[PDB]
Design a protein around this nucleic acid. Structure first.
Ligand SMILES: Nc1ccn([C@H]2C[C@H](O)[C@@H](COP(=O)(O)OP(=O)(O)OP(=O)(O)O)O2)c(=O)n1
Ligand SMILES: [Ca+2]
Ligand SMILES: [Ca+2]
Ligand SMILES: [Ca+2]
Ligand SMILES: [Ca+2]
Ligand SMILES: [Ca+2]
Length: 901
DNA sequence: CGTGTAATCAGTCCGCG
DNA sequence: GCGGACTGGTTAC
C-alpha cells in the first residue's frame, strides 16, 4: 500500500512522525528535516521558483529548522519579505507525501476514553487533580475492545469488583443494561490501589498509543486530569509518557472573558467529540451534557441514578462502572451515526495537515493552497499583520409582513464559491480597478460596462480572464466533492419518502428488509418489493435510509462549510491571503446578483401575466428569492386541480420549464455585463409551498427579515409523503425558547398554515388552559451565561445586570453553604425561570445549570413560586401575537352579531 | 480556540412635558 | 408604555 502519516510534530530541529509504512505497520521516525524558504531575486538570476505574481525567487536551504526561523526574524529586522511555508511540519508533509493520500482507517488507532473521579468538595479541578482517579474505560478501535480500569480501594471507599453479569441484565432485573453487543468486548481490570491502576494504564497506553484521541470533554477535563494526577503522584517525566515523544506543553486557551489550560500531547491528535459535534452538527443545543446529546441523537433514555454522583461509587459501584462504560459507548454510537471522525480524517488528509487542524478552516486552506502552488514551483507569500476592519455583507430584502398563500423559492447553488469561480477572485488574479457607479446602476443595467478586458465585480475590482486562480481552482475541487455527497444525501431522502408512502399500506407477513444502497434512487424492481413488505422490515429500511441521509448530510454540509469558510477567510486578518478587496468583491457581487435577478423575475412574470409594476418577488436574503405564485395558480383556477399534489406538479413543472430558463438568461446577460470568466450563477428551485387543496390554511407568512414559515410539499426535488414546515428565525427555531413552547408554537403555526384561523383558536385556548401542568424544565428559557463576576456586586445584581445573570445570582445566594450543590459554570448554559412577587429567593428569577434537575434543596420552592403567567406571556403569547398580526389572523375569537343567539 | 456579515429579539436604563 | 442607545445572545444566510 501507499504510505500515509498519522501524526507529525516539530521538536527542536527534528520532525517526529508516526506513519503507516508500505506494509501497513505503524512506525515512528525522527527526521532532521532541512527546510527551505525563499527570497525575491534579480531577473538576471536563473531560477524555477516564482512568487504568485510571477516574480523570481531564490531558494534558501537551511542546516536546520531553527536557522530557518532565525532567518525569518532577521528579514523582518531588515524589512524584506521572507517567502514560503513557515510551518515546517506542513512543508515536511508536502515533501514526504507528494501525492493524493489514500489512507486506511482500519490501520489508524482511534481511542475513546472517559474517566471517573469521586469528589466530596465539588467539581474536581483538572489543574489541581487532588482526588483519586477511580475508573477509566478506554475503547481501542483496532482491538475493538473496551478496557476497564477499576479502583477497588480508595480513601473515599472500598468496594467489590464490578459484575459483568449484573451489568448485562435489564434495569428491571436490577441490572445496568449494558448493551449485549458490547458485553463480549469488555476487558475488565480491577486494581487494589490507584498507583498500580495508573502504572498499568500507562504501560497499556504505550502498547496501544492513540493516534486520534477522543471522548466527551477529554481535552478540557479527562486529559488534563489524568496528566495532572499522574504528575502529582509520580512526577513530570512519568506524566509525559502520555506523549509518544515524551513532550507535553500546557497550552493556555484565551477567549474574550478569561482563560483555561489544556495539555498538548505531542504525537497525538486530540479530537474532543463535544467540539467535533459543535463544529460539524449544525445544531445549537440547550445542553451539551452527554446524556442530553445522547438522548437527542440516539433516542436513548437518560442514565438514571439515585443521589449525587459524589456518592454513587460507594452507594452503587456496580452502576458507577457500568455508566462509565456506557458513556464511552455512547460517543461511538453518535459517531457511527454522524461520522465526524471519518470527516475529520478525509479533510485532514486532503489538506495534508495535522488531523486536529480541521478545526481551523484558515489552516486547512493555507495547506491546500500551499500544496497546490508547490506543484507548479510557485512560492507562497509571507503572512502579514492587519488591523481588523469592518466590511459589507449580503443584501436582505425587507418583506411586507403578511400571509402568503402560494410560494416558490429559488436560491443559488453554492453562492459565494460560485461567485469566486465565475469572477475568478484570487490573490494573484487581481488585474486592477474601474470607476464604480452606485450599485443600483448595475442592478438596473444602466451603469457603463466596467471592462472590455477583465472579469469584474461591482465593488470596483478587475480580474484576469486568461487563467484560473489557485483559489478558484482549489475551491472547485472541494465543491465537486460536496456535490457528489449532496447527491447521495438527496437520494437517501427521496428513498425515505418512498418507504413512508409504503408504510401507509404495510403487508401482513414475515420477511426481512431489502439489502440496498440508499445513496441511489430506488429502481422500479426495488419499489415493487417495498410495496409488498411488512411494517417491521419497512421501518428498519426507513431507519437505514435515514442513517444514509445523515451520513450524506455530514459529508456535504461540512464541505459546504469549508468552501464557504474560504470566502470568509479572505476577510480574516490571520489568513495568509486576507484581502478586503477580494472579500468585498464576493459580497458586493452577491448583492448585485440577488437584486438583478429579482428585477429579471418580476419583468418575466409581469410579462406572462400581462401586468406591469407588480412585485412577484416578495422576499430574498443573500442569494435567494421567494416568488408569489397565487396568480399562476389563479390563471388555471383552483377548481381545475384534482388534489394538492396536482398543483404541486404544476408549479414544479412551471418552475423547471418556464422560470429556470428565464432565470438562466437573466444571469447569462449579467455574466456578460460583468465580463466574467464563466457563467456559474445557477438558481435552482428550492421550495414549493401552499395550503392543502380545499383547506382554510394560509400557506405561509413573513413577520420580517429572516423570520418566516412555509408549508412545503416539495423541497429540492423531494416530494413529501406529508407536508413539512419550513420555519426560519421564529421562536420555534431558537435554543433559548422553552422546549414545550417551541412545540406549542410549532403546532399553532402548523394549524395556521394547514387548517386556518379557527383551528388555531381551538389550540391556543387549550394550551392556555393546560400549560401550568407542564414539567418545569420543559417551560424554562435557556441562555448562555457569560461574565457572571462582572455583574456580581456582593451577591446581588450590579448595574445593567442581565436577566439570566440575575437568575444565576439568585441561585448562588439560595445554595450558599453547599460545596455539594451544582455550581453554574461561566460560559455554559442555564435554564431560567420567572418568580412571582414575594417569593423567598428575594428576586424576580432563578437560573440553574442547563440539562439538569435543579438541586433538591430548592426545587420544591421554585415549583411553588414559578411565575406561569409571566412565562406564558413572554415566551408564547408575545411571539404568537407577532405571528398572527403578521398573518392578519386572530388567536382569540372576536365577538360577532351571532353571539346574540 | 477554531472563516465572514445581516438581522431580530429580550432586557436595562431612561427619556418623553 | 414605547423608543433609542446599549448590552447580550442567537439565528439566516
Ligand atoms: N454558514 C454559512 C451559510 C451561508 N453563508 C454565505 C455563503 C453562502 O454561499 C451564501 C448562501 O448561503 P446558503 O446557505 O444558501 O449556502 P450555499 O449557497 O453556499 O450552498 P447551497 O448550494 O446549499 O445553497 O451565504 C456563509 O457565509 N456561512
Ligand atoms: Ca461519566
Ligand atoms: Ca444557496
Ligand atoms: Ca439548490
Ligand atoms: Ca403494501
Ligand atoms: Ca439560500
Amino acid at each position: 500500500m501507499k504510505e500515509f502519516y498519522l501524526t507529525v510534530e516539530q521538536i527542536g530541529d527534528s520532525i517526529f512522525e508516526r506513519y503507516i509504512d508500505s506494509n501497513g505497520r505503524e512506525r515512528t521516525r525522527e527526521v532532521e528535516y532541512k527546510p527551505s524558504l525563499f527570497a525575491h531575486c534579480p531577473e538576471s538570476q536563473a531560477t524555477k521558483y516564482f512568487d504568485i505574481y510571477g516574480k523570481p525567487c531564490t531558494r534558501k536551504l537551511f542546516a536546520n529548522m531553527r536557522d530557518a526561523s532565525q532567518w525569518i526574524k532577521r528579514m523582518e529586522d531588515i524589512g524584506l519579505e521572507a517567502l514560503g511555508m513557515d510551518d515546517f511540519k506542513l512543508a515536511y508533509l508536502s515533501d514526504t507525501y507528494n501525492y493524493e493520500i489514500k489512507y486506511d482507517h482500519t490501520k489508524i488507532r482511534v481511542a475513546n476514553f472517559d474517566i471517573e473521579v469521586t469528589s466530596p468538595d465539588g467539581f474536581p479541578e483538572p489543574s489541581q487533580a487532588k482526588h483519586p482517579i477511580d475508573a477509566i474505560t478506554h475503547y481501542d478501535s483496532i482491538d475493538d475492545r473496551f478496557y476497564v480500569f477499576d479502583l477497588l480501594n480508595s480513601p473515599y471507599g472500598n468496594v467489590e469488583e464490578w459484575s459483568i453479569e449484573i451489568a448485562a441484565k435489564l434495569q428491571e432485573q436490577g441490572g445496568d443494561e449494558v448493551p449485549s453487543e458490547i458485553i463480549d468486548k469488555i476487558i475488565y481490570m480491577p486494581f487494589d490501589n490507584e498507583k498500580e491502576l495508573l502504572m498499568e494504564y500507562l504501560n497499556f497506553w504505550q502498547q496501544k498509543t492513540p493516534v486520534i484521541l477522543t471522548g466527551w470533554n477529554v481535552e478540557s477535563f479527562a486529559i488534563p486530569y489524568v496528566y495532572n494526577r499522574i504528575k502529582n503522584i509520580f512526577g513530570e517525566s512519568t506524566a509525559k509518557r502520555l506523549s509518544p515523544h515524551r513532550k507535553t506543553r500546557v497550552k493556555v486557551i484565551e477567549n474574550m472573558y478569561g482563560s483555561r489550560e489544556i495539555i498538548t500531547l505531542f504525537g497525538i491528535s486530540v479530537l474532543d467529540y463535544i467540539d467535533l459535534y459543535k463544529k460539524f452538527s449544525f445544531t445549537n443545543q440547550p445542553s451539551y451534557s452527554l446524556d442530553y446529546i445522547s438522548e437527542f441523537e440516539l433516542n436513548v433514555g437518560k442514565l438514571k441514578y439515585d443521589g449525587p454522583i459524589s456518592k454513587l461509587r460507594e452507594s452503587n459501584h456496580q452502576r458507577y462502572i457500568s455508566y462509565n462504560i456506557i458513556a464511552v459507548y455512547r460517543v461511538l454510537q453518535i459517531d457511527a451515526k454522524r461520522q465526524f471522525i471519518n470527516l475529520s480524517l478525509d479533510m485532514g488528509y486532503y489538506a495534508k495537515i495535522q488531523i486536529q487542524s480541521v478545526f481551523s478552516p484558515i489552516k486547512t486552506w493555507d495547506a491546500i493552497i500551499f500544496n497546490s502552488l508547490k506543484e507548479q514551483n510557485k512560492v507562497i507569500p509571507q503572512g502579514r499583520s492587519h488591523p481588523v476592519q469592518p466590511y459589507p455583507g449580503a443584501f436582505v430584502k425587507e418583506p411586507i409582513p403578511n400571509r402568503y398563500k402560494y410560494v416558490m423559492s429559488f436560491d443559488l447553488t453554492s453562492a459565494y464559491p460560485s461567485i469566486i469561480r465565475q469572477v475568478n477572485i484570487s490573490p494573484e488574479t487581481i488585474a486592477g480597478t474601474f470607476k464604480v457607479a452606485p450599485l443600483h446602476d448595475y442592478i438596473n443595467a444602466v451603469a457603463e460596462r466596467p471592462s472590455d478586458v477583465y472579469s469584474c465585480s461591482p465593488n470596483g475590482m478587475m480580474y484576469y480572464k486568461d487563467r484560473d486562480g489557485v483559489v478558484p481552482t482549489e475551491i472547485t475541487k472541494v465543491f465537486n466533492q460536496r456535490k457528489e455527497h449532496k447527491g447521495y444525501m438527496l437520494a437517501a431522502q427521496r428513498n425515505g419518502e418512498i418507504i413512508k408512502e409504503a408504510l401507509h399500506n404495510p403487508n401482513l407477513s414475515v420477511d426481512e428488509p431489502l439489502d440496498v444502497d440508499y445513496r441511489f434512487d430506488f429502481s422500479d424492481e426495488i419499489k415493487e418489493k417495498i410495496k409488498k413488505l411488512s411494517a417491521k422490515s419497512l421501518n428498519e429500511m426507513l431507519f437505514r435510509a435515514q442513517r444514509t441521509e445523515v451520513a450524506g448530510m455530514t459529508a456535504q454540509i461540512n464541505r459546504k462549510a469549508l468552501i464557504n469558510g474560504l470566502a470568509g477567510a479572505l476577510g480574516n486578518v490571520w489568513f495568509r491571503y486576507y484581502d478586503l478587496r477580494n472579500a468585498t468583491a464576493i459580497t458586493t457581487f452577491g448583492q448585485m446578483a440577488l437584486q438583478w435577478i429579482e428585477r429579471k423575475v418580476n419583468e418575466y412574470l409581469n410579462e406572462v401575466c400581462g401586468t406591469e409594476g407588480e412585485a412577484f418577488v416578495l422576499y430574498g436574503d443573500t442569494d435567494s428569492i421567494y416568488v408569489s405564485a397565487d396568480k399562476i395558480i389563479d390563471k388555471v383556477g383552483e377548481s381545475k386541480f384534482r388534489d394538492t399534489n396536482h398543483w404541486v406538479d404544476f408549479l414544479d413543472k412551471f418552475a423547471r420549464e418556464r422560470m429556470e430558463p428565464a432565470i438562466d438568461r437573466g444571469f447569462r446577460e449579467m455574466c456578460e455585463y460583468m465580463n466574467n470568466k464563466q457563467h456559474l450563477m445557477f438558481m435552482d428551485r428550492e421550495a414549493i409551498a401552499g395550503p392543502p387543496l380545499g383547506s382554510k390554511g394560509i400557506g405561509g407568512f413573513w413577520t420580517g427579515k429572516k423570520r418566516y414559515a412555509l408549508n412545503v410539499w416539495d423541497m429540492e426535488g423531494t416530494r413529501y409523503a406529508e407536508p413539512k414546515l419550513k420555519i426560519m428565525g421564529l421562536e420555534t427555531q431558537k435554543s433559548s425558547t422553552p422546549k414545550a413552547v417551541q412545540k406549542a408554537l410549532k403546532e399553532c403555526i402548523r394549524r395556521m398554515l394547514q387548517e386556518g384561523e379557527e383551528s388555531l383558536q381551538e389550540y391556543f385556548k387549550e394550551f392556555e388552559k393546560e400549560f401550568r401542568q407542564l414539567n418545569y424544565i420543559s417551560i424554562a428559557s435557556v441562555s448562555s451565561a457569560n461574565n457572571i463576576a462582572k455583574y456580581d456586586v456582593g451577591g446581588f445584581p450590579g448595574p445593567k445586570c442581565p436577566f439570566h445573570i440575575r437568575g444565576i445570582l439568585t441561585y448562588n445566594r439560595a445554595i450558599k453553604g453547599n460545596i455539594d450543590a451544582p455550581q453554574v459554570v461561566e460560559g455554559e448554559k442555564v435554564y431560567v425561570l420567572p418568580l412571582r412577587e414575594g417569593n423567598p429567593f428575594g428576586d424576580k428569577c432563578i437560573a440553574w445549570p442547563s440539562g439538569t434537575e435543579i438541586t433538591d434543596l430548592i426545587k420544591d420552592d421554585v415549583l411553588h413560586w414559578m411565575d406561569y403567567t409571566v412565562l406564558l406571556e413572554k415566551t408564547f403569547i408575545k411571539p404568537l401575537e407577532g405571528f398572527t398580526s403578521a398573518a392578519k389572523l386572530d388567536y382569540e375569537k372576536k365577538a360577532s352579531l351571532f353571539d346574540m343567539f
